[PDB]
Amino acid sequence: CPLMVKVLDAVRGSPAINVAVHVFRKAADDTWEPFASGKTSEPGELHGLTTEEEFVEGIYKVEIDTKSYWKALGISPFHEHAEVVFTANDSGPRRYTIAALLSPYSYSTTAVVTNP
Amino acid sequence: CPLMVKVLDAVRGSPAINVAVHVFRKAADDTWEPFASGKTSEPGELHGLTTEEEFVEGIYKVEIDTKSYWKALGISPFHEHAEVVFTANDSGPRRYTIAALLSPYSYSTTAVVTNP
Amino acid sequence: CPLMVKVLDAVRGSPAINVAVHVFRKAADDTWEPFASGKTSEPGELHGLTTEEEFVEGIYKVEIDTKSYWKALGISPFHEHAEVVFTANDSGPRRYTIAALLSPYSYSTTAVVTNP
Amino acid sequence: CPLMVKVLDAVRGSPAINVAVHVFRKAADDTWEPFASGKTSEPGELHGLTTEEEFVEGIYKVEIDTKSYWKALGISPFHEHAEVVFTANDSGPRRYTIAALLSPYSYSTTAVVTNP
Ligand SMILES: O=C(O)c1ccc2nc(-c3cc(Cl)cc(Cl)c3)oc2c1
Ligand SMILES: O=C(O)c1ccc2nc(-c3cc(Cl)cc(Cl)c3)oc2c1
């Protein structure tokens, strides 16, 4: 999979299930174009977002709807969403895991980038 | 100072100095209006962004130009920038510290919301 | 696997390979007894540390030798090691993933706990 | 103040107040000698732990009693405590801030090492 998202919950010590994720690609007119979307499944993972052929060089945005997640557990969170923005495949194709660790008033995000 | 920003470097164990920060407010029309900007000082802080009068309830975005910071150090970074999007709510007096901890392929952010 | 360790590198955006990990269990005389050890493999994972039958209730310590890792890349890190200490299986058997994200002057750790 | 400790709560977006901290120094004989302790104050800080005279090169351990902090809030935590182990080196004047960000199943820590 060229693009995978992994979300974890720091409060419950569990994968973050049913979290909505939207991915955008920057178009030539500098607007964000919709690229792919999905919801995390039971291990907190979102697979199947794109293919190698479609995932060309560009600037991508991964938006994680953290607010809906915390609201469904009763918590009013601080952030509206978590956004990760990066250039992808500018030196050739890579495989990208975007991971996020979520708390109500905090989040962390890292990237694991591997060369197939 | 209802709004302060603090930026730390996880690679060198130092405040992140000379980091550009821009702050935006969501307009009645769905777009981001420039609200305030600055560069972090020696203790990695940015003060004096707004006043109690102007800092009304709303949705705000803090953008931190992480990519120029790592490029200045000779380290190749993943993210184009770090963004923090949140709602500011009147519900007591409230001062906001937005803190960010930076690594080349990872960042963390938290909010410290106190009341004087 | 009842106990799995996952280590990531925040500087290179890669799994942390060949990291030594030592696991201890608190004995009845309040000393730390050696329980298991290993080195992370290519995806940054350490499997095979114990079995369900051997992994009884108790207090466990997972020590990750972060210093040797950073020294082998040329960096003098801040921490001597990263230690995670927790009670395990006190409500029945669980499966535990201990994850760590490493920078030279920082680290993060979380736990994912699942009920088989 | 060559040594300061700061503790933040990621669940409530607040300084972590009344957290017990103990500091240890590694003795010529491989054991941890008590060096200093205290409880965090309102801004989540612990000051006045040592002096420039006493704070000699060595290996130090900072232990943060996270488990009592979460139990006070009615939240079931994973870790028994958070420990930070590091070497203090004479190589310039150096003041150490040890910062920790706390969630029930996760914590992060960083060091801010500056020079006056
Ligand atoms: O690729 C996977 O399977 C995978 C697994 C566990 C993982 N744990 C982390 C993780 C840990 C901390 Cl403390 C902070 C953040 Cl942002 C991430 O990312 C993971 C990725
Ligand atoms: O030295 C201070 O005064 C001071 C202030 C705010 C601070 N916020 C951080 C912080 C942020 C994140 Cl996301 C993760 C971690 Cl571990 C730490 O450390 C601080 C230190």
Residue numbers in the entry:
A (entry chain A), B (entry chain B), C (entry chain A), D (entry chain B): 10 to 125
Copy the relevant paper text.
Wild-type (WT) TTR is intrinsically amyloidogenic, and causes amyloid fibril formation in elderly individuals, resulting in senile systemic amyloidosis (SSA). Tetramer dissociation is thought to be the rate-limiting step in amyloid formation.
In the S52P/tafamidis complex, the CD loop is not stabilised by tafamidis binding and the distance between Ser52-N and Ser50-Cα remains as 4.6 Å. Instead, tafamidis induced a 180° flip to the Thr119 side chain, with the hydroxyl moiety now forming a hydrogen bond to a water molecule that bridges the two TTR dimers via Asp18; this was observed in both binding sites. Interestingly, this water molecule fills the same space that is occupied by the Met119 side chain in the non-pathogenic T119M mutant. In this case, tetramer dissociation was almost eliminated by the presence of the drug. This also demonstrated that one molecule of tafamidis per tetramer was sufficient for effective stabilisation. The binding affinity of tafamidis to TTR quantifies the stabilising effect of the drug on TTR tetramers, and was measured to be ~12 kcal mol−1 (Kd1 = 2 nM).
